Amino acid sequence: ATFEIVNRCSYTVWAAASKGDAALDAGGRQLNSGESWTINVEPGTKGGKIWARTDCYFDDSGSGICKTGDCGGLLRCKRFGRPPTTLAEFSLNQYGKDYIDISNIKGFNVPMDFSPTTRGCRGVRCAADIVGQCPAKLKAPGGGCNDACTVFQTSEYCCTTGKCGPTEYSRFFKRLCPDAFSYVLDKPTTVTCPGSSNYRVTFCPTA
């Protein structure tokens, strides 16, 4: 399948695409404003993620640091990103369908649209100034708006036992992006698409 990752923000991002234990395609790439990076993801991939990283430095080989979303200090992510990271999430060709979501369960750094480029299903977006509003205890120095489970490490926020409810903090993310997951047991805002769909991720969409 095809992912076209478009930086419509006015600042550079360092896009990342991982499943957790391996890169997807090249695993990451600088995107200056306006730049598109199309990747190939296999069919049947489960639990894939695409995110932005901000305020990075990488040296000639590729090792470095970012202030949001860092994946073990690699330009080319083979693992997931340090919060706060707005997340595009997907598992493809499940049993005849792909399933797409955007998640604020690790926080928020960059606004995002995650739309299918082929018919049958509808996209999902979170574009609200979450970082401008973000509650003080959830602010991340380095940039972004952390989730409560990152800031406090409780069973209730982290839904550790498989039981939890919404919270004042989950609800701050759900007021601003009803169409993204705001905590682990949120009513799912997943989208079911035909198997083998293609997609566009766009950062700052409304930019």
UniProtKB/Swiss-Prot annotation:
Main location: cytoplasm
Alphabetic keyword roster: Cytoplasmic vesicle, Disulfide bond, Signal, Taste-modifying protein
GO cellular component: cytoplasmic vesicle
Regions crossing the membrane: none
Disulfide bridges in this chain: 9-204, 56-66, 71-77, 121-193, 126-177, 134-145, 149-158, 159-164
Pfam family membership, one: Thaumatin
SUPFAM superfamilies cross-referenced by the UniProt entry: Osmotin, thaumatin-like protein
Keyword Signal (UniProt): yes
Compartment(s): Cytoplasmic vesicle
Coiled-coil residues: none
Alphabetized InterPro entries for the sequence: Osmotin/thaumatin-like_sf, Thaumatin, Thaumatin_CS
Domain of life per record: Eukaryota
Entry function: Taste-modifying protein; intensely sweet-tasting. It is 100000 times sweeter than sucrose on a molar basis.
Family: Belongs to the thaumatin family.
The name this protein goes by in its record: Thaumatin I
